[PDB]
Amino acid sequence: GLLDGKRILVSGIITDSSIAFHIARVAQEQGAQLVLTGFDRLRLIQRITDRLPAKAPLLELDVQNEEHLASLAGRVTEAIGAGNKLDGVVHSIGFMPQTGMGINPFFDAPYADVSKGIHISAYSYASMAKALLPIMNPGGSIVGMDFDPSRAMPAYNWMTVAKSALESVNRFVAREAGKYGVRSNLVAAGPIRTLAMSAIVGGALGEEAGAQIQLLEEGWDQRAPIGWNMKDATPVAKTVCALLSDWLPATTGDIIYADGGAHTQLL
Amino acid sequence: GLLDGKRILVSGIITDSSIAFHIARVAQEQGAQLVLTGFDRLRLIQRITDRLPAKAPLLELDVQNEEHLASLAGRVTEAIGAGNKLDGVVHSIGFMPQTGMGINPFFDAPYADVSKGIHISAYSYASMAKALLPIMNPGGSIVGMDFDPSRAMPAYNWMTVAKSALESVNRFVAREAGKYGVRSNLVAAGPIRTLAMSAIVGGALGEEAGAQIQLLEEGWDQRAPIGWNMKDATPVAKTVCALLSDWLPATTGDIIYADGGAHTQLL
Amino acid sequence: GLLDGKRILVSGIITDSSIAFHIARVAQEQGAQLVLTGFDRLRLIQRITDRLPAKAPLLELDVQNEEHLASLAGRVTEAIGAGNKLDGVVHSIGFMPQTGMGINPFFDAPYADVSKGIHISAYSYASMAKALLPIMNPGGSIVGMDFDPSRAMPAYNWMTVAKSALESVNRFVAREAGKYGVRSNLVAAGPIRTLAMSAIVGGALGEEAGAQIQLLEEGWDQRAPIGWNMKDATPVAKTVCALLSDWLPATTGDIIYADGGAHTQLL
Amino acid sequence: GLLDGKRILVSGIITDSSIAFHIARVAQEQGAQLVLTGFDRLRLIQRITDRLPAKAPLLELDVQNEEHLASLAGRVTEAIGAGNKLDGVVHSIGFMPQTGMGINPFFDAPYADVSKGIHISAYSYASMAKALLPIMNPGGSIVGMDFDPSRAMPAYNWMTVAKSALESVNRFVAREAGKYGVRSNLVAAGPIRTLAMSAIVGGALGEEAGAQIQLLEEGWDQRAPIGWNMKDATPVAKTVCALLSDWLPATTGDIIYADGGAHTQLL
């Protein structure tokens, strides 16, 4: 297995459509022993994670809760066993209130909402690394999920800004992680039809917003030299596992694009 | 003059070492009619702005104060006269608490501090554009100040993250501004010996922090094919005035580097 | 005038639709004294340049002709007068045989054709700088024309590769130019309806190639926050003049995008 | 093994210090069946490739020789068996005459020399893909070797330009390759102490050139958050094998940096 014997924490499962669910599934397929973290709907997440190939401890983690972060390393160690450390960490956490993303005008997002989104989507990458680097092994890997924010685009609005901030945070986390012999990287994924995305295409945010996302997806598959299937999360999960493995050992502070090559093509 | 007859709002003067002071001076030299905004210490900044070549109304603007932002367009119009609009806006505002920039470890910055720095340094570019675009003329120009954050570096820490966010914000502000026939761009400046920077070189943050910024400056001038004089703000001021002028009419959502070409050279 | 008293060499006029023709016209409008260079069709170019606002010496320059390059500085000095030097140089020269650009498959371009295109479009920027830096004044400016090649695209093929090479060459020319107190930069322009482009939209290269360029142009104006008028070269000429002026004094080895902000927007 | 059962062509072995030698070794360790190509000194390179873990056919390929390219697919098929195709191709080929790289002034490189370097270092990536895509399986992978040319630097001169061109070529090769379900990517490696590089550090190009590459290496390891050991090619070889594997299936037209994260850090 690509990740045989590795202990990997995976955050961000809320449904079986979560990118984190597929990351977890592929990692287990490849021999990893997981610890999972979830937020808020733990009963729901327990039932979901029971559908993974293998058993894994589930720990509560609200990244805005300072006490959860302060206790996380101790709680992980209790879950994986004293004398064991993590080899991998997956951050698959993002949030921006609908005032900052969707149909609301860019200028009408109140800062308190933007600030909450940046806390969860960008700052928390640093706070999770702070909590977990003390219990990570040399050769380990931290991976976060990104959406290429180098150009502006309709609807994504302040979530784009949060991803820009995340990319910056990743480069600083790499500095810290390197002291432990750990890599930090992001995977910038193409669009994936989560339940939220399928609701928007179906008209949840109105006719315009539905047309804009359809146009995004059509164009994405068009530009990608190898195509892009927004219904298939597996290529993204595999890429995360590649970064968690020993096969990209000289890559850190970086961004790997799992997007069909769309970002390399203008039209 | 390059800016003859243009009405330009300039924020961010606090001392005569402020980059905004030099922007204001060069703009007035080139025929612009200015409106100034200042934060907190208005009596102090009145005495500073009295040293500009020409008189200009000074308005209070704390960018975290929703009431100041709601009233700003009306107060500007009162200053410049009913029926008149602005041709230019300069955002030269930045702030990050010392928990997020300087000698404090990257992981030890509390989010409340980071959030305040992002509010003032990045979000407020959008807030100022929201307030002022309704009173800007077609062909106008919004310019903000940047420090290239595409790579991590010592000390600058979360202010780097805030600049990464600002760059993303500028691309969205360009979308909104374009509806009014207005451009939005940032100038990424090399290091300038403001009073803060001269205090750091002089040892205010310790021997190490002093050594790091000296190494930055030495290396910057070395890499810059035309050199870089950190004691001369005029090249930066001129570049801002170039973007305020009619001579870059097809550039928006962009970043102009006034950095001696340092960012184009590895070594 | 923005360029009052400056002596500026402008290459690349072949018709009154050449971007170089508009650069020359705006520069003369702004007080510059020009020297023009042309290739091959000098009788044609003489009649064209007679339509500029003001008189200007026309010198022959085939950039692949080593003797033309070896004599160019002497010939310029003879044209502008002993004791006078240039303040500016415009490279507006590009060429790629139709085996390397248009409808021919990317893999079917013979290297001799690609090599000729790279010589003219990229290497010649260095060879013109070598010839002319010895007769340029401190504070001077060399500007070349670019088309953003950071992503692949239909049809442009090996001309894209040539522009990628040009961007690299510009960063090295900046190193050399800086020794003379001279800046080197490129202007990356959006698409402009030259006679060649209008022929292609009209069907000269077939129905597919016509549809692809139409799609390029439509999308360009759509993405640009301030729009993009492919029939109007003036915004590009002005940007070149901004770089030739004293108002971007700290920018070198760089690329300024005169493209309506299209490259900053995904959709 | 990571590459179990895959048939992979590897070019660019000339010594056991070649990056291609290590790529070949790691690929064989991971179960790949190789076909090797060599230039000029086949008897010499037979003796070198005899030191790989396993036997592999060695085919002659001078990438400037049109007849070698025309026959290559047939010769590969003969080696691997009728009905069998390649799953991977490695381009590890580079060349720039000393007039274009080293101690010679940038402006003193004759175009004939630059053109030869671009032919071998950049164009041949396309030529090899043209020859081999017709005998590549869906899901296959083409990988070329890069040195980040986004910024200028001492000494590397026109080889930097050739790498800039290669990066552009890779994005076009991705377009073609995608028609076959094949990916095309480059690995941008940090500096590796090949026999050429060790000769330069030892003084072969003079005291200055020696001092410049020592300064490069020192700075590279300093900037890299996980360090950079120029005497260890294995991290680079592994990264190439990661791209040859099934674990980066949605990455194409792209660049993976196996450089210790140096390019993500300013200082």
Ligand SMILES: NC(=O)c1ccc[n+]([C@@H]2O[C@H](COP(=O)([O-])OP(=O)(O)OC[C@H]3O[C@@H](n4cnc5c(N)ncnc54)[C@H](O)[C@@H]3O)[C@@H](O)[C@H]2O)c1
């Ligand atoms: N869906 C796409 O098209 C796409 C593509 C690129 C990358 N991404 C990124 O992938 C990641 C996963 O998103 P997804 O598409 O799987 O959506 P999702 O809604 O399934 O996942 C987001 C996760 O963040 C968690 N979260 C929210 N607030 C939290 C908090 N306070 N503490 C801890 N966890 C919290 C949610 O519970 C959820 O599990 C995000 O970072 C997202 O921005 C999404």
Ligand SMILES: NC(=O)c1ccc[n+]([C@@H]2O[C@H](COP(=O)([O-])OP(=O)(O)OC[C@H]3O[C@@H](n4cnc5c(N)ncnc54)[C@H](O)[C@@H]3O)[C@@H](O)[C@H]2O)c1
């Ligand atoms: N000095 C440098 O080396 C350098 C280089 C690159 C860019 N910059 C940028 O230039 C801009 C100006 O900084 P500077 O170096 O002239 O320093 P400065 O301290 O003189 O300017 C910062 C300004 O921001 C104002 N400000 C802070 N909080 C505010 C608030 N709540 N509301 C309104 N205004 C507020 C301050 O009063 C001050 O006038 C900043 O964005 C900075 O990041 C600085």
Ligand SMILES: NC(=O)c1ccc[n+]([C@@H]2O[C@H](COP(=O)([O-])OP(=O)(O)OC[C@H]3O[C@@H](n4cnc5c(N)ncnc54)[C@H](O)[C@@H]3O)[C@@H](O)[C@H]2O)c1
């Ligand atoms: N037209 C566009 O859409 C567009 C946009 C971006 C930039 N550009 C670039 O702008 C520049 C000017 O192109 P244009 O659109 O004005 O087309 P053009 O055909 O008018 O100009 C190209 C010029 O190169 C000259 N040239 C060719 N071979 C030469 C040689 N051996 N020696 C000297 N001069 C030689 C030609 O005579 C001609 O004057 C080029 O570098 C082009 O690639 C074009």
Ligand SMILES: NC(=O)c1ccc[n+]([C@@H]2O[C@H](COP(=O)([O-])OP(=O)(O)OC[C@H]3O[C@@H](n4cnc5c(N)ncnc54)[C@H](O)[C@@H]3O)[C@@H](O)[C@H]2O)c1
């Ligand atoms: N050494 C480094 O620091 C470094 C770092 C980044 C990337 N690279 C790249 O890695 C690749 C391999 O270089 P290397 O350092 O292993 O050196 P090397 O000299 O061992 O490899 C270069 C290879 O190119 C081959 N070659 C030259 N002309 C050829 C032709 N006409 N036809 C076919 N093959 C030809 C040579 O025989 C040799 O095998 C190159 O692209 C190089 O730019 C090198």
Ligand SMILES: O[C@H](COc1ccc2c(c1)CCC2)Cn1cnc2ccccc21
């Ligand atoms: O020490 C820093 C001063 O800048 C910088 C920026 C970049 C780099 C360094 C220092 C070291 C190498 C890279 C942070 N910092 C702390 N207080 C400050 C007040 C004003 C401005 C900056 C301030």
Ligand SMILES: O[C@H](COc1ccc2c(c1)CCC2)Cn1cnc2ccccc21
């Ligand atoms: O000297 C150079 C050796 O590389 C490099 C690369 C980058 C940089 C330097 C040197 C100095 C700082 C930046 C060119 N060079 C000359 N002969 C060579 C043979 C093999 C490889 C390179 C060769």
